[PDB]
Amino acid sequence: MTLAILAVFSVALTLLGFVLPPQGVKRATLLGLALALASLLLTWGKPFAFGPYAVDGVSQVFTLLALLGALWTVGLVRSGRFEFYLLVLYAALGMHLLASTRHLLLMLVALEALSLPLYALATWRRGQGLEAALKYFLLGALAAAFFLYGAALFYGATGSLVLGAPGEGPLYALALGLLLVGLGFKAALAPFHFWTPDVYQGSPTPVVLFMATSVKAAAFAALLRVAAPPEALALLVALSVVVGNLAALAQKEAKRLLAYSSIAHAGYMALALYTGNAQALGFYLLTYVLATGLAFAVLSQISPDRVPLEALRGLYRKDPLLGLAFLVAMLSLLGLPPLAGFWGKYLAFAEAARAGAWGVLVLALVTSAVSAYYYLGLGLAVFARPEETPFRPGPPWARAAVVAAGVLLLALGLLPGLVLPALAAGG
Amino acid sequence: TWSYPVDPYWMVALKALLVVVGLLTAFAFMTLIERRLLARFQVRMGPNRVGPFGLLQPLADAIKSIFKEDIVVAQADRFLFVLAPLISVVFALLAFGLIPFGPPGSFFGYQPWVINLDLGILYLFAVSELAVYGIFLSGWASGSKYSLLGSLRSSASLISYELGLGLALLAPVLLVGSLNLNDIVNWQKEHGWLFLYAFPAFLVYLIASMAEAARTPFDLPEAEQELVGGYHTEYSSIKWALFQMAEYIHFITASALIPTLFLGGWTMPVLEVPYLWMFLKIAFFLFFFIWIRATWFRLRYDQLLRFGWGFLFPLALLWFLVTALVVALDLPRTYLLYLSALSFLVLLGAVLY
Amino acid sequence: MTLNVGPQHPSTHGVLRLMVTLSGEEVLEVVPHIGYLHTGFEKTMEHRTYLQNITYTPRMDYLHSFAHDLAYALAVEKLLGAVVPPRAETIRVILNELSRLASHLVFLGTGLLDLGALTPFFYAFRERETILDLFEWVTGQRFHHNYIRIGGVKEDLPEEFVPELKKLLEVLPHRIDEYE
Amino acid sequence: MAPIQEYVGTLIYVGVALFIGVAALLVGALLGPKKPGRAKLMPYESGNDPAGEVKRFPVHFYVVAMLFILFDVEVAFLWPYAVSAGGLGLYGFLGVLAFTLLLFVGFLYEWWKGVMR
Amino acid sequence: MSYLLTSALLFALGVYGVLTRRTAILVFLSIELMLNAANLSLVGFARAYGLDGQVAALMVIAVAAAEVAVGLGLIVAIFRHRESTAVDDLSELRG
Amino acid sequence: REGILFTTLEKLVAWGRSNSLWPATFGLACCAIEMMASTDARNDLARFGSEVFRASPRQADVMIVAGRLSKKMAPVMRRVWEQMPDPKWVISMGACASSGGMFNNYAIVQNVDSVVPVDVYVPGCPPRPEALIYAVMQLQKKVRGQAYNERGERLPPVAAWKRTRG
Amino acid sequence: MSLLEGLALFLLLLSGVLVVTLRNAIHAALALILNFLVLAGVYVALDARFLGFIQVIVYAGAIVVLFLFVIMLLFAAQGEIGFDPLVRSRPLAALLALGVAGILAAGLWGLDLAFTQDLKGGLPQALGPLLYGDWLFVLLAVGFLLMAATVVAVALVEPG
Ligand SMILES: CC(C)(C)c1ccc(CSc2cnn(C(C)(C)C)c(=O)c2Cl)cc1
Ligand code: SF4
């Protein structure tokens, strides 16, 4: 009843904010998130379905990741507007509804239910935040139009709005293309990625954390249900990884460079969509969500609005633990042993080779080797001389969160044979 | 339209044309009657002049209205300025055919009504939105923000109460189970006078129709003595006549629909005569509404919106939910009679403090 | 919205121009503009004999004019020490309170009509006619009556004035209590 | 249900209404002195600026209309339950009641924050 | 089939609008045209495959109303005090 | 088209314009209350066809200059008069409007015919409401084309047709 | 059919061309309302009647009313101000605009479907049980979405 917990807690808190101080509302949101997470743990391997709502390994794992991101990003937000939390809750539930169904139209409703609150969530009033949010809104509504005509052409190709239907030839290809348009757009895959740099630079840092973890998690969760063709997948991966890393080289700003890196990271993730393994992909997204939440909590402690690369420099002298954790996250996102990001990347590569697509994989790997440039210019910068840099060294809440995230990354890198056994049915 | 026949299309055109010209002559003579009834209300007596009964003053007024220098204002939109009255009039005339004036054939052979759509109340609601459309569109087209703010008042208030109309109209559908007015009327024949079951909704419908240009928000608005209203202040010969005409047709359409749905739209237990009882109830609602016209003040469109949103709509939706409880469980129909009688006693006995 | 509620419109009684500084439906502040009726009584009065200026006195505040009539009369009298007989003074205060009644009737009729409903304008204004009839009985004029004089009043009351006035004094308390 | 004939009669109704309205507009326009003047065509209110130069109007109208779009969507969803009820039983009533209560919670929020603004 | 070709053509037209229009609100209107064309296609295919696409299109209109409400709030927020809503005036955040 | 070019049609439209006189309220001074009293519940200008009262100038034909026309109101009234439909009539109510009245000074137009084409003049101070009805009856039979002056001349139906307005 | 069918299709297509062409926001939106009326007629012709009535009441009565409200609060109609026209965008986008149709035509060209089903009118009488039923969860999700959008817009404007 995790859906029940989420919906009930959100609806109650909505009015309760009139009687509750913002701190109490934050505590209650935290409680609801933790309760849903625990309910997921107790239902490990407990498929539970009501209608089109279908809880499986994918829904379970990815909504767990989304709840993780939501818990963390709420940890930072202390503003005296309960709304800045309610939407969070709302968004969370939407992304759950994104992963827990096969119904295309319900997929659209969930996409709106998660995207709408995030749009307003980027309103620190900072003018560039509004520019980014407007770009996000217009591109998202366009992609929603595309996704909608995709669901229409799907119903044209089959009597049900559920994936898995037999499907015709060219018409099913066209409907699949129209769905993949919006879904990859939400997945920060090229050639639909352009919103990502602008939004990551403009939006407040913890919001960018929340987005870059939970949004992408739920998007790939829904994507695994699709029977994506190999050729369209080749185009998406090639363009995404190439443009992501290449444009990432030239960036002087931390958030935008990280946006391009996240484009490259989605390009890496999309390989499991070749087989729809959904186990390797769950592992990958676990590692990625942890590392990104870590890095972005660091960026928040630096400056919420904007953080340039030089701001990252000298982090170790300011905070050694934060510098080390940022190094660990940069490496795990580089996919290097013995870190869990390397296992997730390797598992995706195994799925891709098992699908038999060679050139795409080779180009992706060469571009990943290219990625080491900025992965290092971030990770190694931990030790540099502190130049002018905004530094407010956070609470111990986020410090312990960052520490545990890095520890989980390195542990699952050394011993992935612990959780990966339970990313399938989940014994 | 399971049980109701169909006249030939040429008869449809004939009947529509007769309904339009009847609405014309009717609103003219009703302007006379409103003037004279207001007069009786305010001691002063009406036009014992040009008639005898005044019933030739409307012709003089119309004949002046034409030849009255229909002017195309400069600094104004060439097209919308002239076009909007067509919308306001056309989409006002219609939505009157559905009202049953008798059983089939009681039109001396063919049909009392014009059209008997399966989904009627939605038709009425849709074309009701278009009257507000024409109103505020004309308000804009003048290019005078003086009238523009009044047009905005019009649209805001009428749209709020227009929403409330839906929550009012929900409840009787549960009992009837059909969206054609004639089935509702036959129901009112069998079980009897639906308002006995749903008086509160009736109120929130009735009061809602009071906001729909009858009077008392009276922030409809008119130019007189306040921030000028929309749909006037720049039109001279016929278009102004078209706006007043459409507003009065909306008035009579509501004053006929209210007896149709909740009360006994004709369907009389006594003498069961096709037309006369319907016309008499229409005139009765006219007498009450004119009593209100020359008896109650304005509501300022601020208190009016607050009242519409906080009072009418929650109450209407609550009544719908209660009626839905009774219908879904479907055991009695008496429970609704009891609860409605209690509700009316509440809304009435709470006054005499 | 620096909105110009112009002179005489919309039906702004007492021809007046208002520049409503306003954003929305509130009222920030209204800048008034008057002077649209300045006729120059303070000037034209300098050129009429003391007897004649009684013709200029009522027409300025045309609702409660007898206050004008009486104030001007008293000022001139004090200036030259004239004695008003008690009957004259009593008639003056009667007419003063009567025009007060007519003025307040017109004021509340205009106010009630100004925003809201029209009806009660008539009944109260109705009484004004009756009151005017009363005045037409004594002064032969509806308003702008030229009756008062420096010494006192122009001429005597007819026998017909008192009964009509008693009839109105009988109907008025019930009428006013009805409005209240 | 209903035969298509009544819908054709509906279109005929619209055609007749439009025919009469356009006829009335032509009667009004053709019959008149038609001697417009430079001042006659002036908008209103004593020289210029009935309103004239004013800044943008209050968002209150916007808020009311947005409220209206959402809550008329609500009513549009409430109608199918209004017609088909007995087949939906207590289950249908309870589902529609939960839906109604969600949107009524939205209303209670906007009310306790209020819209005078 | 005529209706589905009409849906495709209207979708293309609304895309032309979204790309061409300089102001946000006209872009938003073009998006409305695109979504409604999609719903038209859905109604056709529901007539073909059994009436479920009708409920689909209804839910779609509700979704469009929600996204319109939010988009209008955002459009108001950014360009109420600011000058003409044209999105070409906001280019601070670059690659 | 101007209400002309058929012997019956011009009679008909003149009849209509005569009894359908729709007043345009322009209250200026103390004449205004004796104007309104021509509508109170002793004596109503609400029978001949003047019950309703469109304050708008875009919708009313008779302009009742009730009170002294102060000069600062003259140009405004000017445009207000031009903001009337062309089938319009202008009555000059009171002495102060018709003549200079007793206010023979720098402040008041001594005859409103200067700025607006006057149809009917009405002396009095204030003109008894029934005299205002008499003036509108005078205007009535004028716009019917049934009015003659002391010199024997028939007067045109609509004054303000003969002025090169501009 | 085809006699009035082609006419309705021309009305639809031309109205879309207008709403994407005209620089007057009010005129574009009103052409779009004409489009929606034609579209409700088409829906009725497709035996979906309730959906057409809702398309009229919801879109026209509510949404574009507010559209017009906003552009009247904020004139904004002639958007071509502060142009940065980027002249190349006018033809090139049209090209792309055509392409997004052609590939769709490719999916639909040479495609004939079983359009033989007796909907018996898309009335809510029959549409309730699908809406309240197989779709009841989707309806509840949409309602929650509506509440979330309300809170979003309110907290978004919320001057304080
Ligand atoms: C509708 C009626 C005919 C009753 C009407 C006609 C004209 C007006 C506006 S002229 C006007 C009105 N009242 N006053 C007082 C003396 C009461 C302040 C004025 O000074 C002026 Cl100038 C208002 C109502
Ligand atoms: S004629 Fe007499 S009543 Fe009329 S405005 Fe002049 S002073 Fe006043």
Author numbering:
A (entry chain N): 1 to 427
B (entry chain H): 2 to 354
C (entry chain 4): 26 to 205
D (entry chain A): 1 to 117
E (entry chain K): 1 to 95
F (entry chain 6): 16 to 181
G (entry chain J): 1 to 160
What do the authors of the reporting publication say about this deposited model?
Complex I (NADH:ubiquinone (UQ) oxidoreductase) is the first and the largest enzyme of the respiratory chain, catalysing the transfer of two electrons from NADH to UQ, coupled to the translocation of four protons across the bacterial or inner mitochondrial membrane. All known co-factors of complex I reside in the PA: the primary electron acceptor flavin-mononucleotide (FMN) is connected by the redox chain of seven Fe–S clusters to the quinone-binding site (Q-site) at the interface with the membrane domain.
All Q-like ligands studied here display a similar pattern of interactions at the deepest end of the Q-cavity, with the headgroup about 12 Å away from cluster N2. A shared feature between all ligands bound in the Q-site is a hydrogen bond interaction of a ketone group from the quinone ring with the conserved and essential for complex I activity Y87416,36. Most dramatic changes are caused by DQ binding, whilst Q-like inhibitors alter complex I conformation consistently in a similar way but to a lesser degree, to states intermediate between CXIINT and CXIDQ. The overlap analysis (OA) (technique described below) shows that transitions from CXIINT structure to CXIAUT and CXIPYR involve relatively minor PA rotation component (mode 8), which is much stronger for CXIPIE structure and is accompanied in addition by a bending motion (mode 7) for CXIDQ structure.
